[PDB]
């Protein structure tokens, strides 16, 4: 499922992601707009370590969710990779909050970096009713 911007913006409110361990919901979006472009079903293969991003979140097989084909890969989320290409995103959500209750948070995902970090996310939340 491809999510239109305010249809998502709604759902991660209802799902408790505004203000998620000081994440604010813009962030979520910037984050979810950058990683699949709002799609449940992307999926990212990186040929150099063997692992694979899943989902809206494109969370990783090798700490976050199990696939079974992940080199030296644990499971820290508890969860099958296969959970995170629903439509439902509540799975996706909860390994989502999985990931940034780690120290380094956000920053995890090198996208959020390179394009949410120190800038004007609120176009991304703005005018959906959140």
């Not at 913006?9 to 910037?30: E, F, H, P, V």
């Not at 989502?96 to 120190?118: E, L, S, T």
Request: aromatic share 10%.
């Amino acid at each position: 499922k491809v999510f239109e911007r305010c249809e998502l913006a709604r759902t991660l409110k209802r799902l408790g992601m505004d203000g998620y361990r000081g994440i604010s919901l813009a962030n979520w979006m910037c984050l979810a707009k950058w990683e699949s472009g709002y799609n449940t079903r992307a999926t990212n293969y990186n040929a150099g370590d063997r692992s694979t991003d899943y989902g809206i979140f494109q969370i990783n097989s090798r700490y976050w969710c199990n696939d079974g084909k992940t080199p030296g890969a644990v499971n820290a989320a508890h969860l099958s990779c296969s959970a995170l290409l629903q439509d439902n995103i509540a799975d996706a959500v909860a390994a989502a909050k999985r990931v940034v209750r780690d120290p380094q948070g956000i920053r995890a995902w090198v996208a959020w970096r390179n394009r949410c970090q120190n800038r004007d996310v609120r176009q991304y939340a703005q005018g959906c009713g959140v």
